[PDB]
Design an enzyme around this catalytic site. Sequence first.
Site, PDB file in Angstrom:
ATOM      1  N   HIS B  41       0.800  -1.226   0.000  1.00 47.97           N
ATOM      2  CA  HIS B  41       0.000   0.000   0.000  1.00 47.97           C
ATOM      3  C   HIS B  41       0.838   1.285   0.000  1.00 47.97           C
ATOM      4  O   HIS B  41       0.263   2.362  -0.121  1.00 47.97           O
ATOM      5  CB  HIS B  41      -1.068   0.020   1.098  1.00 47.97           C
ATOM      6  CG  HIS B  41      -0.567   0.201   2.491  1.00 47.97           C
ATOM      7  ND1 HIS B  41      -0.210   1.447   2.970  1.00 47.97           N
ATOM      8  CD2 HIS B  41      -0.528  -0.686   3.514  1.00 47.97           C
ATOM      9  CE1 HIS B  41       0.097   1.265   4.249  1.00 47.97           C
ATOM     10  NE2 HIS B  41      -0.081  -0.003   4.621  1.00 47.97           N
ATOM     11  N   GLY B 143       2.264   6.088  10.020  1.00 49.81           N
ATOM     12  CA  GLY B 143       3.689   6.033   9.692  1.00 49.81           C
ATOM     13  C   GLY B 143       4.375   4.768  10.189  1.00 49.81           C
ATOM     14  O   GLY B 143       5.523   4.492   9.818  1.00 49.81           O
ATOM     15  N   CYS B 145       3.451   1.703   9.512  1.00 51.35           N
ATOM     16  CA  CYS B 145       3.355   0.611   8.528  1.00 51.35           C
ATOM     17  C   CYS B 145       4.711   0.152   8.072  1.00 51.35           C
ATOM     18  O   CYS B 145       5.616   0.977   7.926  1.00 51.35           O
ATOM     19  CB  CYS B 145       2.478   1.020   7.360  1.00 51.35           C
ATOM     20  SG  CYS B 145       0.796   1.453   7.852  1.00 51.35           S
TER      21      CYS B 145
HETATM   22  N1  LIG Z   1      -8.501   3.198   6.394  1.00 43.90           N
HETATM   23  C1  LIG Z   1      -7.490   3.714   5.681  1.00 43.90           C
HETATM   24  O1  LIG Z   1      -7.642   4.466   4.703  1.00 43.90           O
HETATM   25  N2  LIG Z   1      -6.230   3.424   6.092  1.00 43.90           N
HETATM   26  C2  LIG Z   1      -5.516   4.373   6.964  1.00 43.90           C
HETATM   27  C3  LIG Z   1      -4.032   4.388   6.652  1.00 43.90           C
HETATM   28  C4  LIG Z   1      -3.457   2.976   6.791  1.00 43.90           C
HETATM   29  C5  LIG Z   1      -3.407   2.561   8.262  1.00 43.90           C
HETATM   30  O2  LIG Z   1      -4.273   1.847   8.773  1.00 43.90           O
HETATM   31  N3  LIG Z   1      -2.342   3.047   8.943  1.00 43.90           N
HETATM   32  C6  LIG Z   1      -2.055   2.889  10.312  1.00 43.90           C
HETATM   33  C7  LIG Z   1      -1.392   1.785  10.848  1.00 43.90           C
HETATM   34  N4  LIG Z   1      -1.184   1.573  12.158  1.00 43.90           N
HETATM   35  C8  LIG Z   1      -1.651   2.478  13.006  1.00 43.90           C
HETATM   36  C9  LIG Z   1      -2.349   3.649  12.619  1.00 43.90           C
HETATM   37  C10 LIG Z   1      -2.852   4.597  13.544  1.00 43.90           C
HETATM   38  C11 LIG Z   1      -3.497   5.718  13.110  1.00 43.90           C
HETATM   39  C12 LIG Z   1      -3.670   5.953  11.752  1.00 43.90           C
HETATM   40  C13 LIG Z   1      -3.212   5.058  10.826  1.00 43.90           C
HETATM   41  C14 LIG Z   1      -2.544   3.872  11.226  1.00 43.90           C
HETATM   42  C15 LIG Z   1      -4.272   1.971   6.001  1.00 43.90           C
HETATM   43  C16 LIG Z   1      -3.682   0.770   5.609  1.00 43.90           C
HETATM   44  C17 LIG Z   1      -4.443  -0.198   4.987  1.00 43.90           C
HETATM   45 CL1  LIG Z   1      -3.704  -1.728   4.589  1.00 43.90          CL
HETATM   46  C18 LIG Z   1      -5.781  -0.002   4.716  1.00 43.90           C
HETATM   47  C19 LIG Z   1      -6.373   1.199   5.067  1.00 43.90           C
HETATM   48  C20 LIG Z   1      -5.628   2.189   5.709  1.00 43.90           C
END
Ligand SMILES: NC(=O)N1CC[C@@H](C(=O)Nc2cncc3ccccc23)c2cc(Cl)ccc21
Lengths: 305, 306
Positions: B41, B143, B145
Site C-alpha cells: 500500500h 507512519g 506501517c
Molecule cells: N482506512 C485507511 O484508509 N487506512 C488508513 C491508513 C493505513 C493505516 O491503517 N495506517 C495505520 C497503521 N497503524 C496504526 C495507525 C494509527 C493511526 C492511523 C493510521 C494507522 C491503512 C492501511 C491499509 Cl492496509 C488499509 C487502510 C488504511
Amino acid sequence: SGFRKMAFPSGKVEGCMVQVTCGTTTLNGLWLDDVVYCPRHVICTSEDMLNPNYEDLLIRKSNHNFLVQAGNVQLRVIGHSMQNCVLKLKVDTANPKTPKYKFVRIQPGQTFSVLACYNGSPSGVYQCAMRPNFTIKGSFLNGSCGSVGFNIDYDCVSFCYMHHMELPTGVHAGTDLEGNFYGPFVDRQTAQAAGTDTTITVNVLAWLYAAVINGDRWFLNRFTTTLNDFNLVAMKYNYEPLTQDHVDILGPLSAQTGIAVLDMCASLKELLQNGMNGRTILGSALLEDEFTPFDVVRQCSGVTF
Amino acid sequence: SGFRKMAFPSGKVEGCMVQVTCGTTTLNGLWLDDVVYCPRHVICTSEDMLNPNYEDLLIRKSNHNFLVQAGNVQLRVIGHSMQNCVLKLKVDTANPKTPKYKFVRIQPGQTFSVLACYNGSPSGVYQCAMRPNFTIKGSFLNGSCGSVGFNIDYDCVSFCYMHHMELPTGVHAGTDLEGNFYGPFVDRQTAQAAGTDTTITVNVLAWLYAAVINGDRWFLNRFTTTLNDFNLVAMKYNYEPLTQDHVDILGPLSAQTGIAVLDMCASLKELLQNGMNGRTILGSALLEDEFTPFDVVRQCSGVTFQ
Ligand SMILES: NC(=O)N1CC[C@@H](C(=O)Nc2cncc3ccccc23)c2cc(Cl)ccc21
Ligand SMILES: NC(=O)N1CC[C@@H](C(=O)Nc2cncc3ccccc23)c2cc(Cl)ccc21
C-alpha cells in the site's frame, strides 16, 4: 492507537555487552571505549560475600585474572580499578560499537529499559521503573549481574542502572554506572530487605491521560480537587505525594486532553476510594505507575532513535 | 525472580529498518540482503485505498519512483515485484547488517516482539501476541506501517509479522513476510472489523505455571477436571478451547511444578468463577494470556521456588 509497556530499542547497548569472569564467577560487563564496567562482586567467592573487603580482595588480583569475552573474542585487561561498587577493567581495545553515551543517576519514579544478559549475551529487553523504595521489579536470574538499564535521548544512551542483586522478596537492587547503589543496599550477603513501597502518583496520572488519549473516559468526572486535599488522599492509599513540579510536568497532557491535572486527581481520588467496579483502564484492573509523563508523550507521538 | 513482558533484544532488526517513499507516501521497509520488503500500500494514495488495483498501480511505477533511505544513505532500487500484499524492492547494496534470518508464519496464541518504527527509525520495542481473531493489540501510530514482529531464538531472527493497518477498534492487522495477511483482512479501506476476540487459554495456563515456579500457589485447589468439562466452562468466559496439543505442550511446565495440566485447568476454572479476591498473580489482577509455554520456560528459572 494502543498503549504498550515499551522499551527503548536495545541495539546500541547490545553492542556493549561482554562476559567478565574472575575465577569461578561469571557475570556481564559493559564495554564503553577501552573500559569494561561490571559489579565489583565478580571478585568474590560465595564465602567472601558474607563480609568482603573489596580493596583487599582486589589487591590480590592481576589483570590476567580477569577474563573478558566480547562475542567469540577475548579482550586483554591492561588495568583495573574500583569506583564505589563498580570494577573498571581497562582493556587494550576500544569498543568500535561504543555509542554516544552518558552516565546519569535517575530518581525514584523514573523509568528505563533493562537489557537482561547472561554470559555477555543479551536475552531480553523490558521496561521498568525505579520504585520509591529504590528497588526495581525486574526479571532476573543468576548470571544476570552486570545487566544494565538505560534511556535514549535523541542518539545518546544514558546508562542509569547496573544490576547487582536480588532481595528476598524477589525484587532487584543495583547501582548507577558510577557504582553508587540506588537505595540503602550493600553488595554483601547480609540481612537486607526492600522497605515498604508506594505508588508513583505522577505516573498513574500520566497513564490515566494515556487512557483518555486512547479513548477510555469512563473514570472522568465533573469534580476537581485542591493539591492539599488530593495529597491527604494519596498519603492514605500509600501513594507518593504529588508536588507542583508533577503538576507542571503533566501540563502538556492536560492541554491535549482538556482535563486539568487537579481534575484528573479528582478522577484518581474516586478510583482509590471506590475501585474500578469490574472495569479496566488500558486493559488493566490495577492503576499502572510505570509510565512517566514523558513516556506517555513519546508513545503517543512516535519519537524515534 | 520476577516476571516481565519481555521482548527480544531488537538490535538485529534495527540494523534492517529503512524508510520507503513512493510519491507522497512514506513508510518502513525491512532490508535483508539486497531486498527491501514493505507493505504494497506504499504505492496507494488515500483515494486509491477504497478499491485499489495494486497490479494497475504498480505497472505505472518504475524502480526510480521508489526512494529507499537507510540512515543518511539513499539505496538505489534496481527491481520491484509484488508478492501477495508485500512489495519487494531489489536494491544495489546488500545490507551488511543482515542477521541470520527466516520468515515464519505464526499461529494465533504465538507471541513476538515488535520494533515500532517511523520514517525507517526504530522508536520502541514491545511484546505482542497474535490474538485468536488474528489481530494484534499493538501500539502504532500513522507512519508505523512496515514495522515488523519477530522472535530471536538461537541468534536467528524469525520475522513473523509486518504491520499494515489499524482496524476501527484500535487493534492491528498485518501480514507474514510473504505478504499473506493474518485473518480475514485486506489492504483496502473497507467495512472490516475484528471478529469477537477470545482469551488464549494455553497461555493463561503457562502463566499460572510461571506463578507457581516463582513461588505462588494461592490459586491452586484440590480438584481436577476432564478436558471436555474444562472446555465447556472455559468457552462460557470467552476462552479458547484447550486441545490435546496444548496439554502436551504444557507437559514440561507440569513436570517442573508437579501440577498435572488438568489440575491447573481446575485452578483456572475456579479463578474464572471467583476472580482474584483482591489478590494478584505475578503483579497482575487479570489473567494474562500473552506468554506462551515456550516464553515461560525461556524466562523462568528451571528450579521452582517450592
Ligand atoms: N482506512 C485507511 O484508509 N487506512 C488508513 C491508513 C493505513 C493505516 O491503517 N495506517 C495505520 C497503521 N497503524 C496504526 C495507525 C494509527 C493511526 C492511523 C493510521 C494507522 C491503512 C492501511 C491499509 Cl492496509 C488499509 C487502510 C488504511
Ligand atoms: N545472597 C547472596 O549472596 N547473593 C546471591 C548472588 C548475588 C545475587 O543476588 N544475584 C542475583 C541477581 N539477580 C537475580 C538472582 C536470582 C537468583 C539468584 C541470584 C540472583 C548477590 C549479589 C550481591 Cl551484591 C549480594 C548478595 C548476592
